[PDB]
Amino acid sequence: SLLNMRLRNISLKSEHCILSSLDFQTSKASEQLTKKFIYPQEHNSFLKLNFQEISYKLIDGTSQIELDPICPLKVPLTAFSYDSISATFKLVLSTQPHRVKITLAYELELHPNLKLPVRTSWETEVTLTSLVNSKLSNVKFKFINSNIKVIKGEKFTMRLQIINSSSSPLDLVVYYNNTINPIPLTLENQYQLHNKYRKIAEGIILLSNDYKIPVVPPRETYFADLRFIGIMSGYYGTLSGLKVLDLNTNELIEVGNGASVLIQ
Amino acid sequence: SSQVENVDWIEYVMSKIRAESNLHSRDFILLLLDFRNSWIDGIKLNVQFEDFTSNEYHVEASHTSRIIVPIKKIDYKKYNFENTPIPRIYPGRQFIQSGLNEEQTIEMRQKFWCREHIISKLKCNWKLTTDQSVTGSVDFNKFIEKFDHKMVYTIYPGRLFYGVQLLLDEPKVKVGEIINLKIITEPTSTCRRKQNSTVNFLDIVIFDSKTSKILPRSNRRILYNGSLTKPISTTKVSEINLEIIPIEKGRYEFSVCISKSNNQDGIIQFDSENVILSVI
Amino acid sequence: AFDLIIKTSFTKKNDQGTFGETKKVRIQCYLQLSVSVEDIFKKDIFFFKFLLNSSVREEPVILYSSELSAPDTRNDYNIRGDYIATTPALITFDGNESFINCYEITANNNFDSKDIFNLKVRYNTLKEQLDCFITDAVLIEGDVEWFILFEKWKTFWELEILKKLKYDYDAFKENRIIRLLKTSIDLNKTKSKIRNLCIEKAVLDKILICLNKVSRGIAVCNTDMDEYVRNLVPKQLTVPVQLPGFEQFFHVQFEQMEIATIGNSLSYTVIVENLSGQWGQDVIDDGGYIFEILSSNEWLIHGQKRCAIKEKRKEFEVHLIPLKKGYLNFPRVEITNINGKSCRVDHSNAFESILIFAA
């Protein structure tokens, strides 16, 4: 063949949708053939493929439905040797892999009279953190507005929604520590780690420290509404420091992993 | 920024630096008090430090409320907490040596005077929400526990070994345009006695600001003549110079670290002085 | 290091005796300093970057100057970036002490990849620089009446006692103490070695005091040992270095057509163009110069991921889809020939991150 192609699908669980990306290139068989037969006399020839249809169709049984691409791709496109073209498609995801078909209708342009056409197609199967859980217990934590961007110094609010269904109520307390953690390594890594810790420690601060969450009766929820203020511009992806400890067995669950504050 | 001035402490500190624009915002610290009301009725707080006053804060029953009150850092150049005995308000008594050696009695003295500094200048007032004629006040002597090792550093820079200082010629240069930076390092009273040595090294490590990862020691973005790691003395004010040449558009941080020796571990102080520059 | 026997057979004019000695000296032919070049291109400005270093684990050295002399073939470029050391600059074998030396070259007409550049770095060995300090500041300091008597034993002192003093370079680096290693020299044996040769009692006494002082660790750190290098000839290492034999030179710029959440593409227009005109070799718009965008585990490409270059200025829209959370670098790009050739590419946006902010 002369369209060595593959499908490199990758899953986005955060977006809850898999991106199937096909990519096809003119192959070394074509690289040999262009010198062997097409223009043996001319020093360095080139192929002249023309794709007239690129189709991605999800199929099952008698069903066959096309799927549009992410970005505009001009259907009647050209292609020379040593070329590789990629396209992407999105589709929503648990125990039943999908079935897809890629169809490529094209035609060579050996001279503008002879146009050898092709309709090559093949089918296959689509084969291949934000909500935190508590250890030694059942409770679950999620910030309602996980990703928030604001300006420097403007106080902003979160909603730490809680699920509790274990056996009995709890009196967990949430707090932010603005203390530089102790480093455990070359200096080029030690000071990297310290810069991370210092920014975590004195970047964002909590206006409701030692906020005793009053009661969470069993099989019920709670909205631990928190309030913040930032003082150092940057991106606090999966911000640490904000940790919540339970006054039943002295847990230290890192509930702060569900937040992605961005203060400019 | 200028947009966030609705809040009182941010407005006050911005106004102070604007009115006295020679000092820099790193010469300030927050205090972050947290008033918890035990009285059944709601109370209104106004807190005050030397010149400014906070806006009214309505704290209700059994609910804590944090107060971000700013304080100017106290300089060790004109207070001399090192040799200043703790006062005995009942003079005349049999004296018993406390068995506290120099290295820790100096620490306890420093902590005590550091605490005593903010007591005399910080105050606040009441207004009960029900009846407005039940005003009062709060002493902080019998609330504020003794300071700790962490809190000494931030409010007392003299505890740190070196009072470094950085400056660029212009914080705006073109690609390939040369620019030199100077580091002014002066030791402190802590450095003058805490260690028996003569030389300490410092490194001029660089950060990308946006990406916030340290650039490699031998990078593709900043060019310089001579090693970043340099010696300095422990007894005289030292000036170091570097001849930075940026190559890539962006912004860089130029932090500093100071170490005993090139022995992997053993870094004296992880300094916070940094000056950001932009190349475009 | 090799041994070497010299012998003289010299006569004299005034005297008739055919004098001449036969000495057997060691020579350390191993070169102390080492230099590794690294090269940098950027549009129309070149950049040299030398990583000076030492080539012996237990012999730190000191740099004085490394001014890159330009070639003498023609009225060539305006170099800049010569380093003159105000004070000698230490340098070890390895560690976090990379003594970079950077140079900026900007052309006038064009580049020829056949010229040469001579570094001409002047250095000296820490052992020599710190042996001079002992043999001039501890023995014969501030005395001429002493030196006129001691000088008859000069060359013996600098060849049969001083040469074997192995040093604590680690101690000098850390605490700045001039101290010997414990298993350096048998004190009793070297103390005995001086008796056999005749010697003035005062000279024996003062040399004993000096050896005791050196073994006890005189530790002047920074108040001195910058004046005694004046009477030590340095050593030059004029080394040639040459620009690379690249055939072609492209540069590629990713214009951002028209922050950016996951799953929504960002349009871009790539502009590849061959700036080989200003590097001697004429442009060749017919070679096998495939240009490809290396998609990674944290980026995804849509459009033309690879294309053959056959024109001076190629461009084509390409769409970029993020996968990772935030603060990602651009995808790398490569241009490797198919037949046998090599070239170089200046990615203008090589180091420029983009913030991806989900939802």
PDB file of C-alpha atoms in Angstrom, chain C residues 117-231:
ATOM      1  CA  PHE C 117      38.458  31.064  16.015  1.00  0.00           C
ATOM      2  CA  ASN C 118      41.219  30.989  18.635  1.00  0.00           C
ATOM      3  CA  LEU C 119      40.143  31.154  22.270  1.00  0.00           C
ATOM      4  CA  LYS C 120      43.535  31.887  23.883  1.00  0.00           C
ATOM      5  CA  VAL C 121      42.555  31.220  27.492  1.00  0.00           C
ATOM      6  CA  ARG C 122      45.165  32.090  30.127  1.00  0.00           C
ATOM      7  CA  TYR C 123      45.037  29.894  33.236  1.00  0.00           C
ATOM      8  CA  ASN C 124      47.147  28.639  36.111  1.00  0.00           C
ATOM      9  CA  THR C 125      47.092  25.709  38.512  1.00  0.00           C
ATOM     10  CA  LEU C 126      45.838  26.196  42.051  1.00  0.00           C
ATOM     11  CA  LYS C 127      48.779  24.151  43.308  1.00  0.00           C
ATOM     12  CA  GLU C 128      51.275  26.558  41.758  1.00  0.00           C
ATOM     13  CA  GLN C 129      49.356  29.674  42.795  1.00  0.00           C
ATOM     14  CA  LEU C 130      49.105  28.443  46.389  1.00  0.00           C
ATOM     15  CA  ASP C 131      52.670  27.098  46.571  1.00  0.00           C
ATOM     16  CA  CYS C 132      53.964  30.528  45.600  1.00  0.00           C
ATOM     17  CA  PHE C 133      52.008  31.964  48.527  1.00  0.00           C
ATOM     18  CA  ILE C 134      53.724  29.678  51.016  1.00  0.00           C
ATOM     19  CA  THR C 135      57.205  29.985  49.554  1.00  0.00           C
ATOM     20  CA  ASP C 136      57.059  33.818  49.400  1.00  0.00           C
ATOM     21  CA  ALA C 137      54.721  34.897  52.240  1.00  0.00           C
ATOM     22  CA  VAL C 138      55.748  32.509  55.041  1.00  0.00           C
ATOM     23  CA  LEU C 139      59.520  32.117  54.497  1.00  0.00           C
ATOM     24  CA  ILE C 140      60.981  35.284  52.971  1.00  0.00           C
ATOM     25  CA  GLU C 141      58.260  37.819  53.751  1.00  0.00           C
ATOM     26  CA  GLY C 142      59.496  41.378  54.137  1.00  0.00           C
ATOM     27  CA  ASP C 143      63.171  40.396  54.416  1.00  0.00           C
ATOM     28  CA  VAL C 144      66.162  40.821  52.133  1.00  0.00           C
ATOM     29  CA  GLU C 145      68.835  40.060  54.728  1.00  0.00           C
ATOM     30  CA  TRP C 146      67.093  36.705  55.102  1.00  0.00           C
ATOM     31  CA  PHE C 147      66.683  36.088  51.376  1.00  0.00           C
ATOM     32  CA  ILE C 148      70.316  36.826  50.491  1.00  0.00           C
ATOM     33  CA  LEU C 149      71.245  33.938  52.803  1.00  0.00           C
ATOM     34  CA  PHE C 150      68.363  31.589  51.947  1.00  0.00           C
ATOM     35  CA  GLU C 151      68.540  31.954  48.158  1.00  0.00           C
ATOM     36  CA  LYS C 152      71.447  29.509  47.851  1.00  0.00           C
ATOM     37  CA  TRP C 153      68.931  26.746  48.749  1.00  0.00           C
ATOM     38  CA  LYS C 154      66.133  28.058  46.509  1.00  0.00           C
ATOM     39  CA  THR C 155      65.867  25.476  43.746  1.00  0.00           C
ATOM     40  CA  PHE C 156      66.273  22.595  46.190  1.00  0.00           C
ATOM     41  CA  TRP C 157      63.335  23.892  48.224  1.00  0.00           C
ATOM     42  CA  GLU C 158      61.125  24.168  45.138  1.00  0.00           C
ATOM     43  CA  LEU C 159      61.944  20.638  43.882  1.00  0.00           C
ATOM     44  CA  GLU C 160      62.607  18.204  46.780  1.00  0.00           C
ATOM     45  CA  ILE C 161      60.411  19.500  49.655  1.00  0.00           C
ATOM     46  CA  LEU C 162      57.649  21.695  48.243  1.00  0.00           C
ATOM     47  CA  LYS C 163      56.728  19.628  45.182  1.00  0.00           C
ATOM     48  CA  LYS C 164      55.396  16.713  47.254  1.00  0.00           C
ATOM     49  CA  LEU C 165      53.068  18.792  49.447  1.00  0.00           C
ATOM     50  CA  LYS C 166      49.628  17.414  48.596  1.00  0.00           C
ATOM     51  CA  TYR C 167      46.936  19.868  49.639  1.00  0.00           C
ATOM     52  CA  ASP C 168      43.452  19.882  51.139  1.00  0.00           C
ATOM     53  CA  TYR C 169      41.812  21.671  48.231  1.00  0.00           C
ATOM     54  CA  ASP C 170      38.474  20.713  49.774  1.00  0.00           C
ATOM     55  CA  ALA C 171      39.420  22.582  52.952  1.00  0.00           C
ATOM     56  CA  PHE C 172      40.537  25.605  50.945  1.00  0.00           C
ATOM     57  CA  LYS C 173      37.279  25.576  48.984  1.00  0.00           C
ATOM     58  CA  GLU C 174      35.039  25.220  52.036  1.00  0.00           C
ATOM     59  CA  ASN C 175      36.690  27.090  54.928  1.00  0.00           C
ATOM     60  CA  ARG C 176      39.743  28.613  53.162  1.00  0.00           C
ATOM     61  CA  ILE C 177      42.433  26.889  55.234  1.00  0.00           C
ATOM     62  CA  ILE C 178      45.897  26.075  53.850  1.00  0.00           C
ATOM     63  CA  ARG C 179      46.161  22.552  55.273  1.00  0.00           C
ATOM     64  CA  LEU C 180      47.816  19.328  54.154  1.00  0.00           C
ATOM     65  CA  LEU C 181      46.237  15.901  53.883  1.00  0.00           C
ATOM     66  CA  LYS C 182      47.038  13.626  56.818  1.00  0.00           C
ATOM     67  CA  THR C 183      48.882  11.043  54.695  1.00  0.00           C
ATOM     68  CA  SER C 184      50.759  13.717  52.740  1.00  0.00           C
ATOM     69  CA  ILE C 185      54.354  13.495  53.984  1.00  0.00           C
ATOM     70  CA  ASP C 186      55.948  11.712  56.926  1.00  0.00           C
ATOM     71  CA  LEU C 187      56.830  14.587  59.245  1.00  0.00           C
ATOM     72  CA  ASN C 188      59.669  12.675  60.903  1.00  0.00           C
ATOM     73  CA  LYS C 189      61.113  11.508  57.578  1.00  0.00           C
ATOM     74  CA  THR C 190      61.061  14.923  55.906  1.00  0.00           C
ATOM     75  CA  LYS C 191      62.368  16.452  59.144  1.00  0.00           C
ATOM     76  CA  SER C 192      65.309  14.054  58.867  1.00  0.00           C
ATOM     77  CA  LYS C 193      65.766  14.693  55.135  1.00  0.00           C
ATOM     78  CA  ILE C 194      66.987  18.263  55.675  1.00  0.00           C
ATOM     79  CA  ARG C 195      69.745  17.368  58.169  1.00  0.00           C
ATOM     80  CA  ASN C 196      71.933  15.396  55.755  1.00  0.00           C
ATOM     81  CA  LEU C 197      72.586  18.335  53.455  1.00  0.00           C
ATOM     82  CA  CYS C 198      74.528  21.131  55.104  1.00  0.00           C
ATOM     83  CA  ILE C 199      72.378  24.058  56.189  1.00  0.00           C
ATOM     84  CA  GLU C 200      72.508  27.236  58.229  1.00  0.00           C
ATOM     85  CA  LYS C 201      70.903  26.683  61.629  1.00  0.00           C
ATOM     86  CA  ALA C 202      68.615  29.698  61.215  1.00  0.00           C
ATOM     87  CA  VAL C 203      67.439  28.475  57.800  1.00  0.00           C
ATOM     88  CA  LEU C 204      66.739  25.009  59.185  1.00  0.00           C
ATOM     89  CA  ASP C 205      64.829  26.625  62.056  1.00  0.00           C
ATOM     90  CA  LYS C 206      62.664  28.819  59.834  1.00  0.00           C
ATOM     91  CA  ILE C 207      61.908  26.015  57.371  1.00  0.00           C
ATOM     92  CA  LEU C 208      60.898  23.874  60.351  1.00  0.00           C
ATOM     93  CA  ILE C 209      58.593  26.657  61.542  1.00  0.00           C
ATOM     94  CA  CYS C 210      57.092  26.988  58.063  1.00  0.00           C
ATOM     95  CA  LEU C 211      56.437  23.256  57.717  1.00  0.00           C
ATOM     96  CA  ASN C 212      54.845  23.181  61.169  1.00  0.00           C
ATOM     97  CA  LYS C 213      52.678  26.187  60.270  1.00  0.00           C
ATOM     98  CA  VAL C 214      51.531  24.598  57.012  1.00  0.00           C
ATOM     99  CA  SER C 215      50.691  21.356  58.801  1.00  0.00           C
ATOM    100  CA  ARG C 216      48.799  23.271  61.517  1.00  0.00           C
ATOM    101  CA  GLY C 217      46.760  25.183  58.938  1.00  0.00           C
ATOM    102  CA  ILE C 218      47.419  28.879  58.413  1.00  0.00           C
ATOM    103  CA  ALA C 219      44.084  30.001  57.004  1.00  0.00           C
ATOM    104  CA  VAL C 220      44.144  33.467  55.462  1.00  0.00           C
ATOM    105  CA  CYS C 221      41.061  33.412  53.237  1.00  0.00           C
ATOM    106  CA  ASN C 222      40.309  36.642  51.322  1.00  0.00           C
ATOM    107  CA  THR C 223      42.404  39.443  52.861  1.00  0.00           C
ATOM    108  CA  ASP C 224      45.382  38.299  50.757  1.00  0.00           C
ATOM    109  CA  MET C 225      46.527  35.798  48.081  1.00  0.00           C
ATOM    110  CA  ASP C 226      45.603  38.154  45.282  1.00  0.00           C
ATOM    111  CA  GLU C 227      48.947  40.022  45.226  1.00  0.00           C
ATOM    112  CA  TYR C 228      51.289  37.028  44.832  1.00  0.00           C
ATOM    113  CA  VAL C 229      50.021  35.962  41.398  1.00  0.00           C
ATOM    114  CA  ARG C 230      51.848  38.980  39.944  1.00  0.00           C
ATOM    115  CA  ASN C 231      55.126  37.011  39.739  1.00  0.00           C
TER     116      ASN C 231
END
